[model samples]
Target: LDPGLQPGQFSADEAGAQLFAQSYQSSAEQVLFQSVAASWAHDTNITAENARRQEEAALLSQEFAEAWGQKAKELYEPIWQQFTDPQLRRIIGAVRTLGSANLPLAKRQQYNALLSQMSRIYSTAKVCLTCWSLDPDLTNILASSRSYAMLLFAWEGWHNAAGIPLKPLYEDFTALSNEAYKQDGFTDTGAYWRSWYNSPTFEDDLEHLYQQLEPLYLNLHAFVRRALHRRYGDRYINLRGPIPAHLLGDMWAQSWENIYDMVVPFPDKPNLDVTSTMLQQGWQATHMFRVAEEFFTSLELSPMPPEFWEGSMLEKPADGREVVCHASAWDFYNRKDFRIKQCTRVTMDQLSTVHHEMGHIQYYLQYKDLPVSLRRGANPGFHEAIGDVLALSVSTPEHLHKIGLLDRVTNDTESDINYLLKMALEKIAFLPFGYLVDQWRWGVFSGRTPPSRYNFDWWYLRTKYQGICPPVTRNETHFDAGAKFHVPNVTPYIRYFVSFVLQFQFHEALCKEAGYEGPLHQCDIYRSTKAGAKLRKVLRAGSSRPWQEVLKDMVGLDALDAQPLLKYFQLVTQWLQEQNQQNGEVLGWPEYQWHPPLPDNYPEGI
Candidate 1:
């Protein structure tokens, strides 16, 4: 695999570009993969009580990160200067390792170190609002409990528990990371993230996309809020303003699928939620994943390698070892050995999630032959959208019937509306919240948003974008964003929002390719080799072209379009509008401020 180029012997032509990439990738496989392996090894075992393992892992991780930060700039910088051609656009993605790596050695080391500490704090954080609370308790309460007071305390408790320890660590990360970004020719980390889309108008485009979908979200929000007002009698729920964050049935209120019972279009109708069905059938995590695999393989995609089965962590370790339960897909860079690390559950939600994660592995397998740099998604959103596209098909009533998860497929209007509403609760509801995460961070990175307003502006943005409010008082002292995994973890979140729109677009296109011509939601691409053949072309391109170009080639669209998403949910949107009208609910929320009590300075005597 090594191109056998000596130091200072690389050329600048097409042949040279290939050799340069080969050399860089070979080096990365040898050096970078080992570092990544160590980090990934530790990431799966996240526990504060195991500080013994944590300290050593952090040291190795820090050293590798710093070395790469220094080396990535040196190796890639000269190549960008030397390699000038039509191929530059394609090759530039490799050099885009541009980041804190550009910082001086001391700054780079310190800045990179901040990330691990923040990760540690978030992964192992425990608070005592409800007797030694941790993630397991927080998740169980937020999902399973219906008590308003219980969800309220659970939400606040976890935030305070995780956020308090993370606040200072994050504060340091912000300053140094911004410095690193600026040094790397970016305005800040947010700007650096924006650079990935390869469009100057990426942010503006996201804003416009959100606006296009906003009306649908408002209708869903109004209906959900009214349902909540009915449930809690306006003590905690405000019918006219934002819904209490905790009342939405999600820890972050990103998706209200959990609270579907309270707001479903028809209570008497049979809904498509397969969570209970799977449990009654005694489904296990392996079955959930195997089902997902079967779906992809039926379409003629690659079967997961043997290494996948051997190496994947499909469930929580039964040995009483604490593991990071957040689901993730992994690419070891070996091409043949992609794995998913998930503490999987038996629910349909987790079943859908396996498809999403496996989409990453499929993308990896399809593009495995590309140089390492181009092995990523054409756009990050493309990666996220691929698996979800499959999920759109997998979750359909028709597919469910074939899979034996649902007893029947109802084509009636009310049943269709119920299904669409469940989807909207998860999909359309997440748009604003996803966009706002980076919006808030951009301000922090550019110094446009001050520390004093960290908590306040977080709420401000939430009110403005998500049309939701905190269940308790929030202020600068609390790192409210820290409560979410992405914040302290420094994962860019807009990609997920982008995925929401793109998945439907992909689904519509895949359906058309499969020769299905009926309602978009009911169109399943399962076993459609034509659709799979087309998607293979899309996935295999990787970052070889700009995402727009790749999408244009496949779907004949040159931009991130939401028309398919809108069209797919047209029936539900129409129903929601009618319901809100009949209920006399306003189309969109007014400025939301219920004046929650300001609090949380480490839960006092922790």
Candidate 2:
């Protein structure tokens, strides 16, 4: 059944492969990947193994310096220019060719084969990028080899998990759903997931859900922060921030735009494009919404008297919901007899995750009534963004007041500002860590060093850029243990940062529409006023239409401006200063910390 460790035998090779593969499932990769990550780890003694790798590094870095770096500049210049906006026909053409994953049976089979082949290449590529940073030799050899590794991992992993070329998956699922709808059609959109995406009543229900779950939000934020700080000492100053408690409908729309763009460029057709776009967008939106869901589930954030569902329960169900604290979700949804089975999570956290899952289920149930071809949501971001708007609404101060957290508005002005300041600070805090996630993946592609050193690089970078210090050694990256990045399949978590920025753009527009001008959270404007009601109305009407249509309907707008987001960052710095003043002490600003803008040498296949 098992083979012993042999170095050159196929068995040995397999064993060695297994060593690296084990990390995929457990902590083994952390060790192996780190071992290969030449970016930082080094040995005290100059043994043959160490010397060989070091020499390799020198050669690679030199190659990157000589050839790859210039090549990169040459290739990227035009691509960068093209990314901003292009001819609409060109975009649409590209979308048809690049984003169409709606494949037929033969094409789907071929696509699956290609995916399988790519999986191995993708895994190898991730490691190459990671190790390349330290191996300047590799840098000269291929330039940002480590960076390449990260990208490979992210692209490959995501494709694999999401079944990209997305169109085929979308079409296949679409057909299945159409058949189901034919069998059991519903009268109203709100009666199923489509209604959850589109209906006003469902929107109201979602808003009610957000209102009910306030205390959980505060407690979870505090918990996540404390956990990060305890794990990383000061380094977490960059990583720790307030959860994105709310989002606007426009944010959802913008995300769809990105989804449209990114998938349009992908090489696969039909199935890959269709399935990847829809599934990715839908799932992503679900998680984004869970931000607000966090508030709803936490026991600690509940107001002074607390809500009825504040306390922990074995299988408690509140408000037209069903308890699944100890039940199987598959069983709950699959049964034909199980109509109106509203699933409740075991805890606030479980519920937060359930929001995304529910988004998927909601889509399935809603569209189960529609024809398969039409059952799918417009595009990726359209679906991906739905839940976030719903979930984020829970963060409104008025919503908090409903749950009893914000007791008084007049005298509690400082507390209110302080809360707003924390939210601002959290927004500022996300960028550096987001950048770090990018770099860590990049390191793998570069082939700079062994994998073991990635953590050291992580630590060094965290300190330099994030002002954090690890509470434990590389052996104990405990918090990131079993994290999404640990697997090669989830490399582009940094995209969330881009989406977050875009969400704010959407928020700005919605806020303008709601009639509160100055800035975000200047006394919790979204909490109590007309703006709040409008946001709920807009946000709750999920991905029932094309994402752009939804945005146009909600904000009467299209196009995004980075200025608002950039302005928000400036506000964040000012808020930080005010926070220091309020605390009657100086909180050091991290404005001066400099990070290298892409350490990749570029060129050689990068």
Best candidate, lDDT-wise? Answer: 1
Local distance difference test scores for all models: 0.78, 0.32
> Where does model 2 exceed 4 Å of error?
1-385, 404-406, 411-413, 442-453, 460-465, 475-492, 512-519, 522-572, 578-606
**lDDT, candidate 2, 94-129, per-residue tens:** 212211122333543443333223222222222233
What is the overall TM-score of model 2 with all chains considered together?
Answer: 0.37
**Where does model 1 exceed 4 Å of error?**
1-8, 12-15, 47-89, 96-98, 127-135, 595-606
lDDT of 1 by residue, 102-185 (tens): 566676566656776787777777656436435456776777787776777778878887887787788788888887678667
Displacement of the residue 293 alpha carbon in candidate 1, Å: 0.6
Which lDDT value does model 1 have at 543? 84
lDDT for residue 432 in candidate 2, whole number 0-100 = 48
Q: After superposition, how far is residue 582 of candidate 2 from its true place, in Å?
A: 10
Candidate 1 residue 260 Cα shift, in angstroms, is: 0.9
Worst 10 residues of 2 by lDDT: 245-254
